[PDB]
Design a protein around this ligand. Structure first.
Ligand code: NA
Ligand code: NA
Ligand code: NA
Ligand code: NA
Ligand code: NA
Ligand code: NA
Ligand code: NA
Ligand code: NA
Ligand code: NA
Ligand code: NA
Ligand code: NA
Ligand code: NA
Ligand code: NA
Ligand code: NA
Ligand code: NA
Ligand code: NA
Ligand code: NA
Ligand code: NA
Ligand code: NA
Ligand code: NA
Ligand code: NA
Ligand code: NA
Lengths: 328, 317
């Protein structure tokens, strides 16, 4: 196979440090599909990025066809088929992800315009940098010649967290869990939805049989997990964010299993009462590098309220970046 | 059935880079589960809890479970692969660590255990561990020279323009130290003898060997931090090849106990060209050692013997 050209921003950062070795080892497309890494950093981090590339070379990875590094997004994104926009300022303890809306926003205006100018026709664009949904909205709107559906923000770390907590509660293997959904924003208002999930062919909410645990423990544990990692580790998630980035990109490009769906924050067409044009997390299936929102789910009153709270937040964020002039 | 894998220094930088790859399938592939048993010192256990939170958040299908602790006799119980990564960042300080860890392994590891030592000074730590485990066959102990090996492959690929897949039969001889000897005279670049391809002895001595030997310091100069991800990667490569076997047209480097082969003093843990099958290594037989290579091999094994003498004088053997 021709090498897949993959761009990674913030590539000398902590997420990048985890992610690049998984990419080069075969985690994205498997053991027979080479990858070319195109790595972006800010100028003061280029010496460190040179060091990371030395380490990549020193792994003697058979799949790594080559590496280009630089600080010019038009050079690094030239011809790329997958762009992993990870680099942005991190949050720290006591911060909400939305605290970084104005700071990180302008990065995404510029990167969307660069992608628009130079990326491969088949590009798919994943955004991990915070606040992720709004940053993906910024990038998507600044790339009018790339189809809107090519942009996604990462809610897969939230999704995976929710799988982990459900498996723990139920005594199940992670492989038993299917049809998890995270709705809305990658924030504290995210809604992890058990009511459509399955634990080995059984409805998840019925298996747990405990609405109070769902409301008082499960939802806030998942929603606030990032802050819990900051408290435990002293720094934001890195390896697990990199792992979720690989999972989301892999499923996007190679497809979801027939019996399952995943969570991706993508542009709303109004489905499920989610305001049109927001980047919001939905249950989706994928095939051929394309996603489709899962149709037909009955949204119960409790779920409805939690979804709307989260989409309300997204609408507020969208208004703020529109007022800052970052959109279009 | 999950392979029980112990990792020491598990909240360190190598560990951070290693554990997620292990759990994702890098060691045994996509259908073989693993159980992680993570050792740290007591003051690092809080941090290790945070690493386990992130492991759990990955929802890894292969990760059957995780146990953490500071007692090697608990963590190593029933393990079939022990990756001894943690060490004091010299010979004496690490001596107590590896004496204690070899004794623990001897007491509680699985019969089929293989023990890979990444923590420095790796060869002599491995020797100490092996000596302290008289009920585990000596061939189960290896020190990691795979990072040097892969670094050599990297330099040789850059010099020749070949793909890394075109590079075979690289060897690192001796100690994992500045006296290591990376041997191009038996390596092949797309079938052709590597030293004949390069055709430049001054480049070998003045550039290739010192660049390999000093690479860790070059990474630190560049990144401001040590080479954790590539060390992790080498650790996985070496353990994977040990357990699953080497390719039929290739060999790898492993530091293992010497039977005298190639003039390496018996009983030293020393890096040899090896093939693997069934979880067992065999030193590559039949290689002709030229005068230049003999001199460099003997300089390294002299250092290994000096280190063995030092730890013997300290009472660690
Ligand atoms: Na960075
Ligand atoms: Na990292
Ligand atoms: Na691949
Ligand atoms: Na490697
Ligand atoms: Na390596
Ligand atoms: Na470059
Ligand atoms: Na667009
Ligand atoms: Na709640
Ligand atoms: Na949080
Ligand atoms: Na939490
Ligand atoms: Na938590
Ligand atoms: Na609407
Ligand atoms: Na909009
Ligand atoms: Na609102
Ligand atoms: Na340790
Ligand atoms: Na380390
Ligand atoms: Na594995
Ligand atoms: Na956990
Ligand atoms: Na994850
Ligand atoms: Na041995
Ligand atoms: Na080893
Ligand atoms: Na042998």
């Amino acid at each position: 196979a021709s090498p897949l050209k993959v761009a990674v921003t913030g590539a000398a950062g902590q997420i990048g440090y985890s992610l690049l070795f998984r990419l080069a080892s075969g985690s994205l497309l498997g053991p027979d599909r080479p990858i070319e890494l195109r790595l972006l950093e800010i100028e003061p981090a280029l010496q460190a990025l040179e060091g990371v590339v030395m380490e990549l070379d020193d792994c003697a990875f058979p799949l790594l066809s080559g590496v280009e590094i630089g600080s010019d997004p038009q050079k690094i994104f030239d011809g790329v088929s997958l762009a992993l926009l990870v680099g942005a300022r991190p949050r720290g303890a006591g911060m909400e992800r939305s605290d970084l809306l104005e700071a990180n926003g302008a990065i995404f205006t510029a990167q969307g315009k660069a992608l628009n100018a130079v990326a491969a026709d088949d590009v798919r664009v994943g955004v991990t940098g915070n606040p992720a949904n709004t940053n993906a909205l910024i990038a998507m709107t600044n790339a009018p010649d790339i189809p809107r559906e090519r942009f996604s923000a990462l809610t897969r770390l939230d999704h995976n967290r929710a799988i982990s907590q459900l498996a723990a509660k139920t005594g199940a293997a992670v492989t038993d869990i299917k049809k998890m959904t995270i709705w809305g924003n990658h924030s504290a208002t995210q809604y992890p939805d058990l009511f459509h999930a399955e634990v080995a062919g059984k409805n998840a909410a019925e298996v747990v049989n405990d609405q109070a645990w769902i409301e008082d423990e499960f939802i806030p544990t998942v929603a606030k997990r990032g802050a819990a990692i900051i408290d435990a580790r002293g720094a934001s998630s890195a390896a697990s964010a990199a792992s979720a980035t690989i999972d989301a990109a892999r499923d996007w490009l190679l497809g979801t299993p027939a019996d399952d769906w995943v969570s991706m924050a993508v542009v709303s067409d109004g489905s499920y009462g989610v305001p049109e044009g927001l980047i919001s997390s939905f249950p989706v299936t994928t095939k051929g590098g394309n996603w489709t929102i899962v149709s037909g789910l009955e949204i119960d009153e409790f779920s409805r309220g939690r979804i709307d709270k989260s989409t309300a937040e997204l609408a507020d964020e969208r208004s703020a970046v529109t007022e800052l002039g970052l959109i279009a």
